């Protein structure tokens, strides 16, 4: 099985640099092109650049010439990216990926996890971690439903979870918004009215970045 | 470079019906080679692109014969017969004949449903969040489509039109409807200078809104 690993979420500041890896395994890491592919959150897919790890030759797209530089390790079957003078233009999930479509027998197409990156100046920030209980009165449908607010914390991704994961169905977690430069967040979850509250509904809130984790139980009232 | 334009943006699609994807590039990819390399993506959310078929009709290992394209010099069509809920997430060509390998922009297909209404939800800033000093009024619209809506706040009976932070989740895969949350972020001493909190929901479903809403001198 073809896998490309590549190293998790990095955060970065103006004007640094920062480097990333993906490891190859199932295939000659030597016998194809590794690519380099860029992602903006909102956007398409853009290629900066490839390396041929058997003699290590690169190739880049001019508009990246200057901003990475490709680099790789037969030896541990590893390839590395490495981005300098980064910019806000910089933030994206970057992929590397293994293309080739001319050899008869086995087409070659497999991409990494992909790793994000974030250039900011924000502070590392545990977030606020605020219950929501249904409005006084709010108790005559079939269903109720109640909520989890994360405000203030930095860089993502944060890791709600209700009732430690027994509870998944009847959830939304929305995607995380900027407020100020601090991403705040909010996940609802609905239920049988006669469940709750009798039967606790908790909120759980993990925050690798700040090495946090809280539990809120959503109290009634 | 060479530049890849893909139709329609978005692709609303019954659930075993069948959808077209168009892309039409900036210059014939027909490679000297004689090979025309022009591929089709799928990234489902979260998740790394994933090759659905590559020069132009052939299948990559683990695709179903339900999806084929088809095209020559600079037209080409991804067509997927018998559409479902799986398909869901964002599809793009790709062109490599030539050098850098290009994108296009992508196409989002949406899964079609049964018009439905959100159900609303409004909850007060919570003790924690007041004792801080700040208030959050958090408004769920859940299980509705389409996508489209329009969300109201009003306080004391005035629309509020800053400090309103949306999201939306992405379509249900076993529901095809959407959800969102609207967040009306006020200070402490702004939030207790009012009483009634309103959140309006304006959707196709119907013509009158659906209201939400909680008065402070009473919870």
């Known amino acids: 099985e073809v896998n490309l690993q590549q190293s998790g979420t990095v955060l970065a500041r103006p004007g640094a640099s920062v480097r990333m890896s993906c490891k190859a395994s199932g295939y000659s890491f030597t016998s194809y092109w590794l690519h380099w592919i860029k992602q903006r959150p909102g956007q398409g897919l853009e290629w900066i650049g490839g390396?041929?790890?058997?003699?290590?030759?690169?190739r880049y797209t001019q508009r990246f010439k200057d901003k990475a530089k490709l680099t790789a390790v037969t030896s541990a079957n590893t390839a590395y990216m490495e981005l300098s003078s980064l910019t806000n233009e910089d933030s994206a999930v970057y992929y590397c990926s293994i293309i080739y479509f001319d050899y008869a027998d086995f087409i070659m197409d497999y991409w990494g996890q992909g790793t994000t990156v974030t250039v900011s100046s924000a502070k590392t920030t545990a977030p606020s971690v605020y219950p929501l209980a249904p409005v006084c009165g709010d108790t005559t449908g079939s269903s109720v439903t109640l909520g989890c607010l994360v405000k203030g914390y930095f860089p993502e991704p944060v890791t709600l979870t209700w009732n430690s994961g027994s509870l998944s169905s009847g959830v939304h977690t929305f995607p995380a918004v900027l407020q100020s430069d601090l991403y705040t967040l909010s996940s609802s979850v609905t239920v049988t009215s006669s469940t709750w509250p009798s039967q606790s509904i908790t909120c759980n809130v993990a925050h690798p970045a700040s090495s946090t984790k809280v539990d809120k139980k959503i109290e009634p009232r | 470079d060479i530049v890849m334009t893909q139709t329609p943006l978005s692709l609303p699609v019954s659930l075993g019906d069948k959808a077209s994807i168009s892309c039409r590039s900036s210059?014939?990819?027909?490679?000297?080679?004689?090979?025309?390399?022009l591929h089709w993506y799928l990234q489902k959310p979260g998740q790394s692109p994933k090759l659905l078929i590559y020069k132009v009709s052939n299948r990559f290992s683990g695709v179903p014969d339900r999806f084929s394209g088809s095209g020559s010099g600079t037209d080409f069509t991804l067509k997927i017969s018998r559409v479902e809920a799986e398909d869901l997430g964002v599809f793009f060509c790709?062109?490599?004949?030539?050098?850098?390998?290009?994108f296009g922009g992508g196409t989002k297909l949406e899964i079609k449903r049964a018009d439905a209404a959100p159900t609303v939800s409004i909850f007060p800033p919570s003790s924690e969040q007041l004792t801080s000093g700040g208030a959050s009024v958090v408004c769920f619209l859940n299980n509705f489509y389409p996508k489209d809506i329009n969300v109201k706040w009003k306080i004391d009976g005035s629309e509020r039109q800053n400090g309103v932070l949306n999201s939306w989740t992405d379509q249900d895969s076993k529901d095809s409807t959407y959800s969102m949350s609207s967040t009306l972020t006020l200070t402490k001493d702004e939030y207790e200078r009012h009483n009634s909190y309103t959140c309006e929901a304006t959707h196709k479903t119907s013509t009158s809104p659906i209201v939400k809403s909680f008065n402070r001198n009473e919870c």
């Open positions: 790709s062109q490599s004949t030539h050098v850098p390998r290009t």
């Open positions: 390396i041929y790890p058997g003699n290590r030759d690169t």
């Open positions: 210059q014939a990819l027909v490679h000297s080679n004689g090979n025309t390399y």
